[PDB]
Symmetry: D2
Subunit: 498 residues, 4 copies
Amino acid sequence: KKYIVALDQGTTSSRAVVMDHDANIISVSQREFEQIYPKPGWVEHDPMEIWATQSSTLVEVLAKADISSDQIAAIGITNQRETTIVWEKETGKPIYNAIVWQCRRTAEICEHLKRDGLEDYIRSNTGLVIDPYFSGTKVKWILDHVEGSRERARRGELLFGTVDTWLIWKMTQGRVHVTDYTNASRTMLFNIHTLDWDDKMLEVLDIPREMLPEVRRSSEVYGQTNIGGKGGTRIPISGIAGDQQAALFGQLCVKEGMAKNTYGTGCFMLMNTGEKAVKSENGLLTTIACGPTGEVNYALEGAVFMAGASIQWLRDEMKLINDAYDSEYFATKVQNTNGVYVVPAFTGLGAPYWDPYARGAIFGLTRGVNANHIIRATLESIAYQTRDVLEAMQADSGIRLHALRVDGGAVANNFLMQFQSDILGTRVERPEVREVTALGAAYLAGLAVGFWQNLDELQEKAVIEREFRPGIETTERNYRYAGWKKAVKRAMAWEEHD
Amino acid sequence: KKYIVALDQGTTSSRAVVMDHDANIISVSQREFEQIYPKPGWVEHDPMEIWATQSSTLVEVLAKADISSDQIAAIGITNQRETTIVWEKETGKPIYNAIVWQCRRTAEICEHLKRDGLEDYIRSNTGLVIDPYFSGTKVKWILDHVEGSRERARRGELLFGTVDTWLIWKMTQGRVHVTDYTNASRTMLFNIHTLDWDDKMLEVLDIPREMLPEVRRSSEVYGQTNIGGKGGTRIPISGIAGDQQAALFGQLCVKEGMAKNTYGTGCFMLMNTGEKAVKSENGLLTTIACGPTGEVNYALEGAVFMAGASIQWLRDEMKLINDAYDSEYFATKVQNTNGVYVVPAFTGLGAPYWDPYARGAIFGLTRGVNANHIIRATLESIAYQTRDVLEAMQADSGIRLHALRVDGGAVANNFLMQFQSDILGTRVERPEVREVTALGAAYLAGLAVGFWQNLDELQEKAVIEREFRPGIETTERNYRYAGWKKAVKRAMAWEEHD
Amino acid sequence: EKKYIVALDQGTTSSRAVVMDHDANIISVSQREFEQIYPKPGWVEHDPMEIWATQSSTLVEVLAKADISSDQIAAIGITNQRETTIVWEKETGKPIYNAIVWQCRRTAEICEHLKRDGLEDYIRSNTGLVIDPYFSGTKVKWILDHVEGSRERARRGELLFGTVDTWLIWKMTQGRVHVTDYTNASRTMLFNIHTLDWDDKMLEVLDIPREMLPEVRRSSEVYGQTNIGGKGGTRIPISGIAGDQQAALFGQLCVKEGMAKNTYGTGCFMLMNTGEKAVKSENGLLTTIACGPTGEVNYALEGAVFMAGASIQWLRDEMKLINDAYDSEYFATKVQNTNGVYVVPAFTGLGAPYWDPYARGAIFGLTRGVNANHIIRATLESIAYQTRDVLEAMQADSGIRLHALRVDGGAVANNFLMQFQSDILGTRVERPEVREVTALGAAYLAGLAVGFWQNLDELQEKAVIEREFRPGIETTERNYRYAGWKKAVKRAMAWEEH
Amino acid sequence: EKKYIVALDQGTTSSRAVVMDHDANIISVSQREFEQIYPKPGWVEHDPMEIWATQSSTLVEVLAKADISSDQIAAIGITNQRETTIVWEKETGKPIYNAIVWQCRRTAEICEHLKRDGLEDYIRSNTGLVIDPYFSGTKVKWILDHVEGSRERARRGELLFGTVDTWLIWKMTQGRVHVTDYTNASRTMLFNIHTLDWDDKMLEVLDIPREMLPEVRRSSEVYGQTNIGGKGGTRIPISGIAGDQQAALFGQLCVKEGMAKNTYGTGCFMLMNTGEKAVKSENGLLTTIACGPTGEVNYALEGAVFMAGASIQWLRDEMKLINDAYDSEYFATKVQNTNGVYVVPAFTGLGAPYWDPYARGAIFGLTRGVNANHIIRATLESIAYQTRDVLEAMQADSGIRLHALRVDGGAVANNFLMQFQSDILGTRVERPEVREVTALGAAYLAGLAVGFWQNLDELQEKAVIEREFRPGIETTERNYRYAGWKKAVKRAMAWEEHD
Ligand SMILES: Nc1ncnc2c1ncn2[C@@H]1O[C@H](COP(=O)(O)OP(=O)(O)O)[C@@H](O)[C@H]1O
Ligand SMILES: Nc1ncnc2c1ncn2[C@@H]1O[C@H](COP(=O)(O)OP(=O)(O)O)[C@@H](O)[C@H]1O
């Protein structure tokens, strides 16, 4: 009994990870899963595939690392936060695929609410923005979209759930219908002061309460699981959080003012705002983090929809790189983007913009622009975007951050990193372990299980493997930025409202 | 006595065709040359390299076809229209590279003029539009960049010329310094009415009249060349015309209201308006063509900067494809652009927009979008463009095309062909022989020296290879076209000038 | 309850997991490729943890993905890559050396003495085996000698040995179980095929402590149970074991004497069923245990080809000449002959009927016009060649003239291959509807065991000849191309220095 | 006045034209590759016209682009690929058949008849050539026998026979002149190297009308003029011709006995000057004619290897393994060695010291973990091997172990290869700054005639070794690797089936 196990249900892959008591990484599992675009603007995931992969990674992580059911103190869980599931309570079968948080299909529905004038209400109790991004719209969607859903829904025959929930249920044979604070926040269904489903929003979206599941603390005993092994082995489930929050947490951004920015399929920037929830005026998200004890807290969140994904697109779709990591190479074979700009609004915009109608776009093409500029453009867009939110933050925040605690798959790229310090004019912290989403999940659980007795017990745990100071002139910084800002403006509003 | 040679010094390649009296392409020779992009929006060529390749070709088609210097009746010359070259007479060495019609460096220069109510005149006098495209401002520009050029030139130390102009001089060792009408009407410098150098123009731009060459007829001995051989052999240069203008003539559009479309590096639609010059109101150019005799005729013209070039760009720069023939195969792997649009303003706008500041851009980008979608979007810009002008054409022309006739490299592409057909809803006629440009120069030089008594002998000559009636995909046309429009507006105004 | 049977295929390049219904319908498949280690030219290894880890996650995964729950599995079938040797520590359960693969050749040295020593007839007689590094014996000894004080702990109980099945079953029973079937045991070169038990002459020759040995068992029989979680007290019976080859002969219903099949996976295996008589080869073929219609020990004539689908992987992965294995046929068909080039896929020694551990891969007949495609096709070709090779011996040894070859394996997707083979043999060819005959074989057995099925014939109406390739062209070529091939071989033979 | 000499390099794969000056620098170059045609597996053909046309445009382009007038050219030097045989109609000036590339193997059969009729000794002694389908003889005859009434017209004075120097010049004199040189003429196996003239037995044995051969001349000397137009009445002396190998040797100032060079191109050639002395060789080398310090007649030991640069071109154009020959280096350095792989590149048979028309190209040591890097790498090494093969025959035959190796050719750029090479022989490898040496010879051969330069000394210090490669591999290793090759080689032999 001396291992903790984090579960990370990524946007593109399912991960499984293994730490010890000194919190190292004994092992990793990963599997990607099919991403579906039934139609341009839309994103879906197979719930079944989401599962399997997530299960198998679990099982495969121990196997290979040669660990037995028995030594697993507990299991923590983080997931991508907005994607929505709905299935028959009985058969445990989805009434429709999972709609990822990217999928813009409920834009239209958003229009309605915007118009009924719920904007202030929503910013107010949920702290969210009216976006197809959030779960509510989605649920109403399956709901309206499937024959007598609403009905079954009422007869409590159907279960609504995010990923964490779905995970756990499956996990516990349908025994446990739960989810933690953090994940509830982004549903735009649950009140954040109150701390429990906004009664108003259910009516609004026309959503039968029967369907929701209990909400709990992010750090706590929720259940157990039997994955086989040596007769009588049950594994506990003591930790749940959205990756974002997980990272935040595994980053030890446990006081107000503390923040990090993560780089994976998207970009997330979160600042801990302690016990008090700052209402943003600069196009940010107010949300729930975790205190040093898995306690409710608040946070300022800036969400970027596309980051490493552009890069995935380069390779899967554009097929211009053979592997992610190549980007560094190619992008550095030139001195600039040669006037080029990418606006990766592939799935709309996001903070601080919030533009369901924007699409992805390339700018300032000329004859002599080759592929290397493009790729490089792609990277930098990442860098701009952040700049977009960071400011917003300092705006809303009132704090002027002095360095950037980043993390994610992509922090591995040094270019992007340098580029980022430059463009920012800020220091950039690069911790020695980049799977913190996973840590935050280990941390939360084992906490819940006295695997660790408190945070501090970790503290000297977090190590900056490298830091980046800028190097470029203010003039050009702003100079390049302006370009970016203009590029943005050309993109927004592309798609037509039906 | 047996053959005539056409010479096509095209934007991207130098060429040499051998026709017989029967009007048959007996042998061919292509050579490609370097495209220089000193910087974004600028495109130069090496004048020597132009020379270089163009001589090699001629020398090459001949050998190959086992043809002796004596057997050639005349030499015709066609060329890329607007590139300016400038050299010393005493040495025949350029003070600068050829500056391309593409090249957008003289934009500032155009704003001065615009600023000086110079417009009405220019249009009036030259039938052109203020824009970086003309050798006008170009010339000037070199003059201002090279130390004490002006003075030398005044003292007639420096020669000025277009391409034909440079070729002929080169080929007649300095002996002859001349130009034809068509060409000359593309300088901004020359009066299409008058039939001679506009002084205001020469004044306004401050170009020394010494540098200009003799404007001549499109069909007329001008001199001769010595390419060795038996000995005593001298070959005459009987024909000259701007390629756009040569193509039109080779299409035998010698009567008023007869049109053609040309797709090579760029796109150029022309209409023979007979002895009367029609003034554009729709963004079109008024220019000089040839009569059925090689005599001054007038044409309305639409000009698109980027046509075949894009495929080359995907090719050389993007490397998405291996060959331009390819493109088709990729485009037909998908059934729509996935809503992605491309605007090939790599080198500014042009007809009917004229916007030296537009730069290329790709729009409606999304995650399921791949290379093919892209390649295909690329070909579509092509038809979109042609549709654009084709309409100014009919506004201006008042004539409704009951069918397009076309030519150039690109027309071998049936995707392009058929698309174009459905996009326009008009029929598209494709010849068996597509180098109708060379033909036109064959035709002129030939007509000149008695090789053929008239166009008559050449009428029975053509043959349509394919006629592209518009695929049912002629219902959804404004719809497609409409995205197009939207898209363009978004391309417009990229580069910074203020 | 219990509607499903699960086959486990632990192949040389991947591990699978297959779910059948009572109708013997693959309700789900799972794969995951795994590393191929070549510490040195001529040697192949695997990681027993990786073999494990893969095999694990697959099972878990097919289940998952198909929504089948543990309570529903009547039993589990088990198949494996046959010769590969593993040696762990009973306590820790950890290995003291990587799986050494049948392919591997480090043992020829040892093998060298055994020849030296006179051990032919015996080995062959009692084993029906030949002296070669293909078989586990030599391998074992090897590790024993390489690992320090192996023999001690070996005799002190301490170390276990196992083939794959051994290794997987040991692992799914927590160590509780240490079984093996006949089929499998035969391939060790350690155990007596007549006697039905470990041959101690051997054990003595090779100096292998019987402590470390496991128990030979019945191919169809409950050996034990596994626990993979679920509704407490859930466990699954392990009723089936076979070497995939034999495993395959069975799935294919070749349970009567004179019945054979050919299998095209990573390699090539032809086996004929000899009823209860163990026919002694005299043409380079092996004699091995097989399965009667009840799991009963039968006997077989077997031809073992080391490089078959392996070659194609080489091309794609190593030569990188291909993207997908399915590509191969396309390219090959791109040429029309191989331009007289031959490929000899002896990357891993010779194998029947030659057995030549000193031969290495080689390519012949190259010329300046020989290109990739020709080469590819040569590769494919080499497969139908090695086949015709053994097929002859089969009918030497068998004395039976097979009228049509029945086939199976992953590579039979190849129409080209299938056709070429047809022609090369000048015999018809039967492609089944399903190709996972191997996993099938395994389900059958373990299901027969647990009464899933009461008899084969139940399953007879299963098997649908999806396609039949009849011999194409005339003899002449046949023999002609063959001679070509023979030549080649002889020059492959004897490369390595020993 | 006349401030420049121009060299025409006509190679097996591309047509060149170089422009130098009095200070023998290179003002410019123009190349162009031309189609390799393989009618049948082991058959090598070229469109005479393409050879022509390419040489033309190249000549033209150098001038044109360098801004150089016919009036400025002191003369044209000429070199070519050596065995490729062209035969055309005197009237029309048209090839009766493609040009048969030296590489071509189609005449083995015929070489058989030869050996069989006891001629090995003679051929070896008057011509200095070994019986193979390498040389011109059989080619001609082949043609001859294959074209209906050729022989007839060929006596009837209507048909012409030429190597490539010869087809060029005549194409550039409008048929005025039909000449050839010592160097080239010696590779036909129809020319006696002492007598220094057309072999009768030769013509006899082979049935070739004396009436078709150009006339044999010096290497440096004025043979004609050409007119390429320009400023009226401009003529250009054609003042030099040599087989490019001999050209290289020459352009290396390889001019006294003991002096030798290795050239690495589409093939690989190694030759060493034996002065005036014609050494018959026992070790498989070639005996031929080279140039004296004045263009006078010299002699040499040649070592001819069929594929060097061509092997890579096969990776690049056929196997598509690399996209650029220069890449080679890159790839092969991603590996420490070659996983026991060996590439024997007998695409075109053997060649010295082997001499095996039946030999095919092959690959050995194949194993599962062998990737394309190893193949490329092996490819490279084969070059090094073969060199070491001829190299030895040479020391055998001449008693001298080369202290340093003077090299050149297009492939000498490959640093890897260079080094490997050093390693494999355990000899120093001198790399000149200008590797374009074949041309240079030609220029030298020309300007010299035309008195452009009066002596070679004028030319001496003009040479500079850009790089020296010393062997960095332990003897054992060195030899060890050799033995392997040697083994591989044999397996390669006699693959082909001779009825
Ligand atoms: N099959 C093809 N499909 C599409 N575009 C093509 C195709 N072939 C050539 N192109 C383009 O057409 C142009 C060559 O046409 P051409 O008319 O010969 O040149 P130019 O206008 O300068 O004289 C290049 O831009 C080339 O990519
Ligand atoms: N870096 C390199 N490595 C290997 N071969 C090279 C390299 N660079 C050029 N080459 C090769 O050298 C040959 C060119 O020979 P060169 O001396 O130019 O041509 P030629 O055949 O006419 O003598 C080509 O076959 C090319 O494949």
